[PDB]
Amino acid sequence: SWRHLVCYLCFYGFMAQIRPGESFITPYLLGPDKQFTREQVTNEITPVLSYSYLAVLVPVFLLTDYLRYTPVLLLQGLSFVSVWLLLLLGHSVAHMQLMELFYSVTMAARIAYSSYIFSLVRPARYQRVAGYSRAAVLLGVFTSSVLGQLLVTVGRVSFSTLNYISLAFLTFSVVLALFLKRPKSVLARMLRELGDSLRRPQLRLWSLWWVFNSAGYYLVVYYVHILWNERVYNWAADAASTLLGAITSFAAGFVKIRWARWSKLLIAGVTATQAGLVFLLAHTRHPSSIWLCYAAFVLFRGSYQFLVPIATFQIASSLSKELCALVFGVNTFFATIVKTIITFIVSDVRGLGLPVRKQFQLYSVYFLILSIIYFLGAMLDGLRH
Ligand SMILES: CN1c2c(nc(N)[nH]c2=O)NC[C@@H]1CNc1ccc(C(=O)N[C@@H](CCC(=O)O)C(=O)O)cc1
């Protein structure tokens, strides 16, 4: 299986992220297809995603490496199929809450594929496979967005037919996941090994990056989404951003930079670049600079997605046991915790309610201080002689 091991896995990663009808879930609900209201979707349906995500991210990471990453990938595929079954056949708001819960389950289980990538290949070329995997996933997301948008805009396709197409694609993704090769008080032993592994320098630094920079990137992405929502150029920017992320993840898969040294400077410079990109993003105004702003966000996802195929790799090379998925899940869970803490701090009305521009200035400052802390840490241990 020289061709059936990593090529097939990246093929499945690409085809499992194809969902032409995913990007139009809201407008499909708000129309002469479900007869929903904006208030119903934005109170009783959308927050169910957040509730379920920061509840189901825990068991998924806790047991995902125990059952060898294949059954939970099949569960993610079946959960996408269940999401689209609820979408095609759902009237009460309870069914849409169930659909949001299942979509949250898939979002939680993405880490399972992220770690199954490392569980398959031999622990030597981890980086070159992480890059390929992230590139395949981002190509899948970009293809899904492009296909859905061109099907609804260039062609004349009703949302029902698009959702049927997406259901067929998800069924094929489940069929593809069926054939994946399954690799070879447990909680106390796992926690002890987790604490033992966190003492390593590279794993510690990159886990901190995943906890903080990923949370910042999620916050920035969601708030650019709401800011642009608050039109064809929106999908154009999102698709271009995903494409640049895929290209940069492939490049990171090809990167040869040493990691014992010349690594903290790398993360510091990448985070500083992200801070500058958000800095430019916040202060765009009525003039055509918005177009230039449209580029900056793309470069934003051209930076964070340049480090995920590296970070995961650098965590896969520092975990002696087969706990490469528990650490990824802990990092994602804590990133979600940090993101929701910040959202409670600023986004909510009961919190420090500020305009979106103020939020983006605050995120620029937060990325800048993260990069400054990383730079200070790099300089503190620079000599050690
Ligand atoms: C279905 N969800 C939803 C909706 N719209 C409504 N009205 N209700 C919903 O529940 N639109 C899609 C949304 C899903 N929300 C999200 C949240 C995060 C990501 C997300 O993780 N995007 C990745 C892109 C790359 C990838 O998929 O791996 C990211 O980097 O943020 C996707 C959808």
Q: Going by C-beta distance under 8 Å and a sequence separation of 6 or more, which residues neighbour residue 31?
A: 159
Q: Does 53 belong to an annotated binding site?
A: no
Residue 59 sits in which domain range?
Answer: 1-184
Q: Of 143, 159, 184, which one is at a domain's C-terminal end?
A: 184
Residue closest via CA to ligand 1's atom 20 equals 107
Listed residue (154, 115, 335, 146) closest to 242, CA to CA: 146
Do 273 and 151 belong to one domain? no
* Own/partner long-range contacts of 306-309 (Cβ < 8 Å, ≥24 apart): 306/245, 306/248, 306/249, 306/251, 306/252, 306/270, 307/209, 307/213, 307/252, 307/267, 307/270, 308/134, 308/214, 308/249, 308/252, 309/127, 309/130, 309/131, 309/133, 309/134, 309/135, 309/249, 309/252, 309/253
Any known ligand binding at 141?
Answer: yes
Q: Which of 151, 184, 217 is the last residue of a domain?
A: 184
Same-domain check for residues 29 and 39: yes
- Same-domain pairing of 269 and 216: yes
- Same domain? 229 vs 151: no
Same domain, residue pair 318 and 190 = yes
Indicate whether 347 and 210 sit together in one domain: yes
Chain breaks in the chain following residues, C–N > 2.5 Å: 184, 230
The CB-side HSE value for 192 (13 A sphere, CA atoms) comes to: 5
Instruction: Categorise residue 306: left if φ over 0, alpha if ψ from -120 to 50, beta otherwise.
Output: alpha
Question: What's the CA gap between 169 and 147, in Å, rounded?
Answer: 12
| Nearest to 5, CA basis, from 122, 110, 124 | 122
- Domains: count for the chain: 2
- Among 49, 104, 218, the mutation site with the greatest number of ligand 1 atoms within 8 A of its Cβ is 49
Question: In angstroms, what is the C-alpha Rg of the chain?
Answer: 21
Say if ligand 1 is within 6 A of residue 304 CB.
no
Among 12, 23, 24, 25, name the best residue to mutate to test ligand 1's pocket (greatest count of ligand atoms within 8 A of Cβ): 25
Do 178 and 191 share a domain, yes or no?
Answer: no
One domain for residues 146 and 211: no
This entry's atomic model was obtained through cryo-EM
User: Phi and psi dihedrals of 345, rounded to 5?
Assistant: -70, -45
Both 112 and 236 in one domain: the answer is no
Q: Are 104 and 98 in contact (CB under 8 A)?
A: no
Does one domain contain both 314 and 251? yes
Which of 184, 199, 220 is at the close of a domain? Answer: 184
Resolution of the model in angstroms: 3.4
Q: Distance from the CA of 125 to the center of ligand 1, in angstroms?
A: 31
Return the ligand 1 atom nearest residue 103 CA: 1
Whether 238 is in the pocket of ligand 1, judged by its Cβ within 6 Å, is no
Dihedral sign, Cα of residue 109, residue 15, residue 297, residue 262: positive
Question: 103 CB less than 6 Å from ligand 1?
Answer: yes
- Asked whether residue 322 falls in the same domain as residue 360, the answer is yes
Gap from CA of 266 to ligand 1 centroid (Å) = 29
**CATH number of residue 300's parent domain:** 1.20.1250.20
Side-chain-facing half-sphere of 327: CA atoms under 13 Å: 34
Are residues 94 and 129 both part of a single domain?
Answer: yes
Of 22, 93, 95, 242, best ligand 1 pocket probe by most atoms within 8 Å of the beta carbon? 22
